[model samples]
Target: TGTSNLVAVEPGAIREDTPPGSVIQYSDYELDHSSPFAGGVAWIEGEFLPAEDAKISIFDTGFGHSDLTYTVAHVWHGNIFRLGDHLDRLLDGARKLRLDAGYTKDELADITKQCVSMSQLRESFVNLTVTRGYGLTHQVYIYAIPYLWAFPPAEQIFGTTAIVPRHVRRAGRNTVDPTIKNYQWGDLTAASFEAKDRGARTAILLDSDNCVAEGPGFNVCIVKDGKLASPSRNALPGITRKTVFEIADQMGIEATLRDVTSHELYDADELMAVTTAGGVTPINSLDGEAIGNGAPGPMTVAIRDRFWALMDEPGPLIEAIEY
Candidate 1:
């Protein structure tokens, strides 16, 4: 076998001085710039594109079918946090899905490093994706963009609310293995509209056994009488969730993984949610009532405060993002 059907694409783009715009004429001079991807960049199809100009080849319904798995590794204060772990999850997901990335972990890590490095962003969210290229080889794409937060300051301050959707539950394990992170979000998508209608910021779904499965794209844990508890199943083994339990241990706060129920959520003195993109969010209200004292509780504050400071702590895991 000489080759795969996929056409060879070697990185090239809208070359300099000749802007690829309708009004942009063939210019001999262009303005000075900061970095090539100040706004963002996508390394796709062997080409590095300014995020605005990046588009994917369709008829590729990896798009239509969501036949892809991805992971986001974030950079904070010029350091990429837990990059190796993130890469592990990304590659592992591909393997479990029976899709090949073609590149080794180190090779893919270098590409991600390059994406973050060339972009020259001190704070960024890097997303790496492997899609089953329709009727061809698998496609790998990586993009580095500005940092995104699921919980901004306002949400953290006054705190956010959630709805336990009456109908939509997490995608059953039979339909999609809950462990492997994928883009299948129909249940989440439907629940979100329900969330909006109820005037809540997010929605939490129950499992088949009526245990707190998770919220959309995030994990939840409750604090009751100084103890922290998260769902043991039907949830992504989240890196952020991992960090919290680790952080909780440092502070002498015992954290457990068990079947947290709807009643337990309402009874908890403090309830918080964590996501890789969102950081730490204190959910002060659930359903129609308040959780804890209706403000960020002591445990919530300590965790949030520790989580942010944890970002810049000098360590081997916090790899220096050389700009």
Candidate 2:
């Protein structure tokens, strides 16, 4: 299987020294199939155009119809942390959606390695999406589009406030589990928009039973009496969330998972959210109540510091790419 749209990158321009945010026009490079980097920028395989230059149809089932399953990984200091975990989640999502992604885990890993190698950014976010290819019949489109991107750093990690809104969650496991990361996020987006309009960074979601679920794009965790508590099955099993759990355990803190309530959010000693980008940000205020003096708490700072230290080191399976 070859790539469709690709950006042409000049061999000379494909240096490791390219600045992180430098946006160069794809028309400045030559296109060819000799190497994946033939386009001096992000590209699809067969298509000799840059990623930014490629366009999708409005009627495409992937975007228009939400027939896509995608996963995103946060890049810290140019390194793609927990890539294996991200790919695992991606494949799991595809399996849950019954989408026939035409690639295997090993192949996807290699592709990700190449993409990261080409980007040359120390810190950024990468996204991989797989859509049922375009087709007249529902079964006609079977391919997936794997895309990557770099974005500005997330300031929320330092500390961002949250708002508890009236939006309900996507239900628990029995009702249609929301833990599987997929492209069907219109509801979450609407909730986030509502929060943004109110000057909040993210909105905490609750289940029909009024149990705290999570944020629009993060897993909710509240600290009380030195214990870290978050929702159980209703929350997305994020790679970073798992890591935070591990950290909490190592720190001799119990990371309890269950259905949290708004009262708990308001009464907890502190509150925070965890994701690849969010890291461990203090909520400061939840539903307008101040969290732990309205500043980053000691436990939050400790865990965040530990996470960063882990990132500075290499994971067990971090394979170096020599492109």
Candidate 3:
């Protein structure tokens, strides 16, 4: 037998710098408890269950071969932000993966709403997933849980740090399609470890040509000469990145999608990362070096403010949940 030993990180041994209440402590007895959903529920295999009780088969293709497509949308003030757009992306990925989700886009949308309603959470994280199941079957999973902040709360105020690892590059499109949202994280996990070793919060990987790609789950952007630029290839077309373009257009800022090189990153006046989990997060430093004045830049702050402001204003992007 070639089974490997497993070691767990002590809950108390987490980094002291991590914010208070950021880590959840569960006793051994509590580990067997259900209802992981802070105030939420899960739709699993056509029935709703307490989120902690939701389970999938161990032999499912989704678990064994990563044959799944998923997307996440967040709720703010009882409204789901960009729900339609997220579902569209998930359906697109399902098409690419050839996984039949067993529900129309509109049907899935309704199901998601129901899940959120059952959770009864005013602000929360909503995830919808489609999986290739045993043999020719397919499965759909949906859940609404307590809101999650991707970065520490302080990162939003002061900005976070990142590193560009030396040895790892993003998995090329030839090997894995970067556009589809799947569970492929081999190179990304390695890069994250490298970033941790160097005392950074996360890492942004480069492509084969030494051009900036993206971070683990977020898209990277840099500000230069009053213009915003991001990688054109080998990156996910992020919904938050799309929102940034919309915000920039409304604010009369020039935004470009093109190849961003390693040299250009270090020279950027302001750097930021965008994702569904954190919205617009400023990256104040790269590889321990300061970006701009080693603080959040003016434009980064402006865009972030506008981004949150839009969350409150009703729009086509926001789907109001009936609680």
TM-score top scorer? 3
Writing each residue's lDDT as its tens digit, candidate 1 over 281-308 gives: 8888888668866787888878877877
lDDT score, candidate 3, position 118: 70
**Per-residue lDDT tens digits of candidate 2, residues 1-323?**
23111111112222123223322111122234464433222434323233344455566677776776777675554456787888888888878877766778887766666655554433434566677656542221111112221111233344666676664354565655677775565556666766666677667887777777776667878888988888886778877778888899999999978778767877888777777743666677766656878776888878866776675577752344333
Q: Write down the lDDT of every candidate, Cα atoms only.
A: 0.76, 0.60, 0.79
Clashing residue pairs in all predictions, respectively, total 2, 18, 0
In angstroms, give how far residue 238 of model 1 lies from its true place: 0.6
lDDT of model 2 at residue 94?
78
Q: Which ten contiguous residues of candidate 2 have the minimum total lDDT?
A: 143-152
Model 3 lDDT vs. the true structure? 0.79
Model 2 alpha-carbon miss at residue 163, Å: 1.2
Tens-digit lDDT track for model 3 on 260-316?
A: 999999899999988886578889899997898999899888888788777768878
Q: Could you arrange the candidates by lDDT from highest to lowest?
A: 3, 1, 2
What is the Cα-based lDDT of residue 244 in candidate 1?
89
List the candidates ranked by TM-score, beginning with the highest.
3, 1, 2
Write down the TM-score of every candidate.
0.86, 0.77, 0.88
Residue 26 lDDT in candidate 1: 22
